[PDB]
């Protein structure tokens, strides 16, 4: 019901503020490695 | 650049010996590879040469059909069959190289034919 | 020996000089433009370093 919706809430909350995160992460190690 | 051969062989009269070069630091095929024969109580003899990638080869006119000169690119190698052995090949073969001319700068360390 | 591709150039002379010193020493300048190759290796393409040659090769003399 209402209750499983917010799983469709987090669902994106999640990414809103992990998604962003995963990019993060990735562009550190990206430059880190190909510098040399 | 280095010159790798294979241990001595003892080989009986009339039968043929194969001994090796392996070119350890350079593509075989790049070089000419030279053999030289270094029996005691003379000096050394310039056998011919050989360059392993292309099959050409310029044996001495002494050591024409005695030596016969090979490669093999799989593993860098340039090779010589003695045929019809006999006492008087009981000497150190080296396979020398010159690079920036016809003298000898890189050698091997010298396979002893005991025969 | 990776030229691929040459010319003199010839605007008004022969960019040519030539400067025989009194013993016979002969000096040689020629303005020549080249498209030498180079093979590239683009492993990591937008940040890599290259390394371009020129080889200046005999051709109807040997080393002796
Ligand atoms: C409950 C589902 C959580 C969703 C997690 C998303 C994280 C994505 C990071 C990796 C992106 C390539
Ligand atoms: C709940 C936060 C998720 C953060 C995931 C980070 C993934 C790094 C590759
Ligand atoms: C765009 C962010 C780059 C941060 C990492 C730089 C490492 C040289
Ligand atoms: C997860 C990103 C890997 C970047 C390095 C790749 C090296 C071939
Ligand atoms: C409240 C989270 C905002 C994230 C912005 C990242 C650009």
């Known amino acids: 019901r209402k209750l499983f919706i917010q799983r469709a809430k987090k669902i994106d909350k999640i990414s809103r503020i992990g998604f962003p995160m995963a990019f993060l992460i990735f562009n550190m190690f990206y430059w880190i490695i190909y510098k040399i | 650049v280095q010159l790798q051969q294979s241990g001595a062989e003892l080989m009986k009269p009339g039968a043929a010996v194969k001994i090796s070069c392996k070119a350890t630091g350079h593509t075989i095929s790049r070089y000419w590879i030279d053999w030289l024969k270094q029996r005691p109580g003379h000096g050394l003899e310039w056998i011919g040469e050989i360059l392993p990638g292309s099959g050409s080869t310029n044996y001495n006119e002494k050591f024409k059909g005695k030596a016969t000169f090979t490669a093999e690119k799989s593993s860098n190698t340039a090779y010589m069959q003695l045929s019809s052995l006999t006492s008087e090949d009981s000497a150190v073969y080296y396979c020398?190289?010159?690079?920036?001319?016809?003298?000898?700068?890189?050698w091997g360390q010298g396979t002893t034919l005991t025969v | 020996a990776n030229e691929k591709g040459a010319h003199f150039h010839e605007i008004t002379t022969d960019n040519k000089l030539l400067r025989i010193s009194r013993n016979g020493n002969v000096l040689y300048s020629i303005r020549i433009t080249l498209t030498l190759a180079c093979p590239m290796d683009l492993k990591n393409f937008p940040m890599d370093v290259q390394t371009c040659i020129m080889q200046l090769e005999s051709f109807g003399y040997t080393m002796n």
């Open positions: 020398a190289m010159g690079v920036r001319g016809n003298y000898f700068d890189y």
